[PDB]
Swiss-Prot record, chain B:
Region: Disordered, residue numbers: 100-119
Effect on the protein upon substituting N157D: In strain: PAI
Mutagenesis or variant effect for Y200C: Loss of capability to undergo conformational changes that lead to pore formation and translocation
Organism classification: Bacteria, Bacillati, Bacillota, Bacilli, Bacillales
Consequence of changing S176C: Loss of capability to undergo conformational changes that lead to pore formation and translocation
Protein name: Protective antigen PA-63
Gene name per UniProt: pagA
Covered residues, full protein: 203 to 764 of 764
Outcome recorded upon mutating R27S: Abolished interaction with LF
Region (Domain 2, membrane insertion and heptamerization): 86-271
Effect seen on changing I34A: Loss of ability to bind to LF and completely non-toxic
Annotated site, Alpha-clamp, chain positions: R5, L14, F63, F248
Length: 471, 519, 388
């Protein structure tokens, strides 16, 4: 008799102590962890929950992940039992076009936004403080992306509009997956928001596969336009807000199409009509810990790691999570000397941000561990469920949406030093509009956003004198 | 063979005497209650019904709960066998907008909604802002340009919000907007997950509007009732979408099409006892505890319920000395209210226990099935809908004691969040050394001035009605009197004489620092 | 092995001899009737049909009722195997409002001359036909506030029965028919804490000639059918109540109305209450399996009669204080019994009068006055909560 409680394929003994997958002649073999041979061979130390079928609480089993009997599209980092295989998709706008109802056209830049808490002056209702309801709790579980219209006379007059006249908006949009799991059919509903709450239009579209870290209207094919039955309608007064801000918001929901599951006896992946993402996704968002990171690119990446919870006993069955090991399996951190580093960039080079309860939980730990610095007790900091952790590069400056806006004069001059400019540094890069000059070539050579002016001053300053200029 | 009557997993022996859940290496283990080891480790003493699958009569079994093999969204207080995991949802209105049936003939005011439990069902009463929208907007019936023949069309921003213990995964309940008492205006009904103690159109996303196929239609005569009351009612039913269940071998939760909330919810509403509490916030919270019943033998199988232990597991009461207290606030600081038969049942108990005070025999008061108990904070006053309206003059002065900033432009003060909830506005006036009471903000609507900052301090701005200008210091020796007006004392409309003055409004002295103490 | 024919849970041994339900540690226990302890503890002696799964022929078994593994909404008096757990619902009108085609408060009570209820329009504050401004050609449109109210023993979970408003005797004015709101026994559908229901796509239309009949009588009739929504059943293995789409009330309701005896009583309130008791039938052998029914024990379990001295009394009011009414065959069946028992008085041989199936008995208060349905400056009475 083999002792297995979760009936996954991994016994209680290996699931608790440690295990890995190896190849004999060709056949896949599950064996307990031995540092004397497995670690030296180049294998991963796996540990999951013996009472939970899926530690990550996702539709794919712990066994399916490690053996490889999973949907091949599922992220390699997600092929670990302690890493959540779940999808997240935001709408990326490529360009806009504005005309009078029956023409100005500018290219747009979109990045996934993870909003940070209000300062200490911003107006909030009585329920914002009320325990339970309305509390933003640092950052909440949702998909939202902010666009940026190219600033490069008077849009209200370039089209020929007046207080009575209405302007119709049309743009080129693309669906793009930032998660760990694939959506095989139904696309989520999205809504274009002007300013804060002014809902302009609701967009919702098939059997085209949306792969993780891959675009839906694939770059090799043409993208999608906006309603060409009835297009977006905007009044003159709301149009002047768009001309003044030169930006919009895109709020996309987490309701996705049916999940394709693996079947052991026939070794084939089939789209299961029964299990949908909407019934499994909240289970993950309540058991796992959220960690945000922008190492490879200055874009906010959401990855969830299987975390322990003291209240629920079934979540206590999940192996104890450390900040060190979690960061390694979730993004790709390496321990060469003893200090953690992401592909070269040291852990100390990255900023540590948390919410109300997350920071307070770590506050108690830092006092019990005595060491006041987070980098010191990095390997001993315990991770709890429902936690929200934001890790960003110290080299750049961040706004309320936590996106890379600008950098120090030492930073800009370092990449712009070559005859060639770095791709990560250039991302934060005589008139208010006469600024677009950079034309990035495919060879890797270029031929701040926080300091630039989208509209002239109260004095109508159509000059580069007031604009904060660098080398 | 294991003696188990309810097939849950918990045997008859543990289910009757006592049990808890612990972790060995990693594995979950069910063991009988031992105070010498378990109580010290930080565990909860569980006891349920050996003949009932679910003691609370809910869709989630006694085992599924404590073992954690359940819908993770289910409230932590509800994860206990003697606590009901059931949903309750009311409609919260954020703001309204009124226009004539078809540019500047449109009135828009922000609304405040709280769940009302009139002194079982879901009902919520809204409150339309009485304060000015335009510079000199007078008579709503004329601000839009309506007459006896003309009709006014209502539109508002609404949000669905869960106050229960269980989640609804799809179908939203039907709701109806009621003017006054029975005048049914409109009936509203829409795979987004509604989590307990969480909003449906999540705060990070935009809310929902009201019919933009056919909107709400109101006649001139019914519009004058809305202008006079400045309030509406929202009656929502308990018919909800299908419940998501757990499967043991696959440890994943799927939405069961077979079992719906409408078939299981009434079973709970007949087996458990109702207890209402507003500790954390002055909002009415409905929580049901598994209660005993002499008539039904299957309900006699449920462990005997005490007022002490029930309050602890249902809301979060703690016993530090021996006296029960909610996060600090003592049991005596809370008022005890019951119905006809509930109070009469406890009346007999109090005489048998001899002690006439409920707080004395608190640990010995037995709880019966179908009981209805209302517990409210003694600090505040309560209306017919049992919601916090006002408080004693003394209590208001305690929260407005903490002064952060003293300026002619504004007054930033560290006012308590629970106390400020019964506040409608404040009166701004300059009292002479001579003895003259000249009032700046002097009208029936000129009351909204408090602007709560995210830092935790309420900002009082006099410039709001002082034509965007700070208070003029005619003499620095003069007393700058800033009062306080409760929600129960404020006037939504002027008197028969057209009283557009703060003189008649019951004002509570809250700030009286002289002109030189500020600037 | 223990013999069980109906498979209900209770064996053929107890169903004939006698049984009661008791609590050990917490666990429910079914044991044979022992007067030495069970009678002294305060338990009620149960006895059902060993071959019939449901003695009352209702969707809930003999076992489901006594153990408590039944729909909790089901009446406590109905939790006895010899008492029928079946619903009866009439329409209660609260107030009326009359206007010309383009207000008085009403009182309604269930009438037992099927479900039928007669309303009473307030006569108190000239010529209704002229107060609205109508003539022989003009038509009057009726609108009223109505409420569905359960008088039975079982709950309806969804579909509401069809009802028809009748002027006078047969003049059918309008047919009303409405959801998943639970209608609990002895509880209102549009719950008193919420707003009631109004009357109508197209409203009720009445001619001038028919309007003068309503002005002269100041009363109407409400005929409601017995077709109700699907019954929610209990499932043993998962201990949860689920609405069974298969079994409806319309297929089970007549089976009860052919096996049980009907007894009407107005003790607690002067409103006609319909309650059915499991009765014996000589023709059918399966109904002979049901325990022999007595007038004494039936009245006790159906309404709440008590035997303190030896004489039966309802919460204090003696059995003699209530009148005894029957039909053609019911009275004739008891007529033979009274002659065989020799005692001509029904109150004498009260404990020996046998009850048969399909019987119809009406028990009303002797003190008060009853009509055929067995129920302007004058309004001044304003009843205070003190009881005066």
């Amino acid at each position: 008799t083999v002792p297995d409680r979760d009936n996954d394929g991994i016994p209680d003994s290996l699931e608790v102590e440690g295990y890995t997958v190896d190849v004999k002649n060709k056949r896949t073999f599950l064996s307990p962890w031995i540092s004397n041979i497995h670690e030296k061979k180049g294998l991963t130390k796996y540990k999951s929950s013996p009472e939970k079928w899926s530690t990550a609480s996702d539709p794919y089993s712990d066994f399916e992940k490690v053996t490889g009997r999973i949907d091949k599209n599922v992220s390699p980092e997600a092929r670990h039992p302690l890493v959540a295989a779940y999808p997240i998709v935001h709408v990326d706008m490529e360009n806009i076009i504005l005309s009078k109802n029956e023409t100005i056209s500018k290219n747009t830049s979109t990045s996934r936004t993870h909003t940070s808490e209000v300062h200490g002056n911003a107006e909030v209702h009585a329920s914002f403080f009320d325990i339970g309801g309305s509390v933003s709790a640092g950052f909440s579980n949702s998909n939202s992306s902010t666009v940026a219209i190219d600033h490069s006379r008077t849009w209200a007059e370039t089209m020929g509009l007046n207080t009575a006249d209405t302007a119709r908006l049309n743009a080129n949009i693309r669906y793009v997956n930032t998660g760990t799991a694939p959506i095989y059919n139904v696309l989520p509903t999205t809504s274009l928001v002007l300013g804060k709450n002014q809902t302009l239009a609701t967009i919702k579209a098939l059997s085209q596969i949306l792969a993780p870290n891959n675009y839906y209207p694939s770059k090799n094919l043409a993208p999608i336009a906006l309603n060409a039955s009835t297009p977006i309608t905007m009044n003159y007064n709301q149009f002047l807000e768009l001309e003044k801000t030169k930006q919009l918001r895109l709020d996309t929901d987490q309701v996705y199409g049916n999940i394709a599951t693996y079947n052991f006896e026939n070794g084939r992946v089939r789209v299961d009509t029964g299990s949908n993402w909407s019934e499994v996704l909240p289970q993950i968002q309540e058991t796992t810990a959220r960690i945000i990171f922008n190492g490879k690119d200055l874009n906010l990446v959401e990855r969830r790691i299987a975390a322990v919870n003291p209240s629920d006993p079934l979540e206590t069955t999940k192996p104890d999570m450390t900040l060190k090991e979690a960061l390694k399996i979730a993004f790709g951190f390496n321990e060469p000397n003893g200090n953690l580093q992401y592909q070269g960039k040291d852990i100390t080079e990255f900023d540590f941000n948390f919410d109300q309860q997350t920071s307070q939980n770590i506050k108690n730990q830092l006092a019990e561990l005595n060491a006041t610095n987070i980098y010191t007790v990095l390997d001993k900091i315990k991770l709890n469920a429902k936690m929200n952790i934001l890790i960003r590069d110290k080299r750049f400056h961040y706004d309320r949406n936590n996106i890379a806006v600008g950098a120090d004069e030492s930073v800009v001059k370092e990449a712009h030093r070559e005859v060639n400019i770095d791709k990560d540094i250039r991302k934060i890069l005589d008139r208010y509009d006469m600024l677009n000059i950079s034309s990035l070539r495919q060879d890797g050579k270029t031929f701040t956003k926080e300091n630039t002016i989208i509209n002239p001053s109260e004095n109508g300053d159509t000059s580069t004198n007031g604009i904060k200029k660098i080398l």
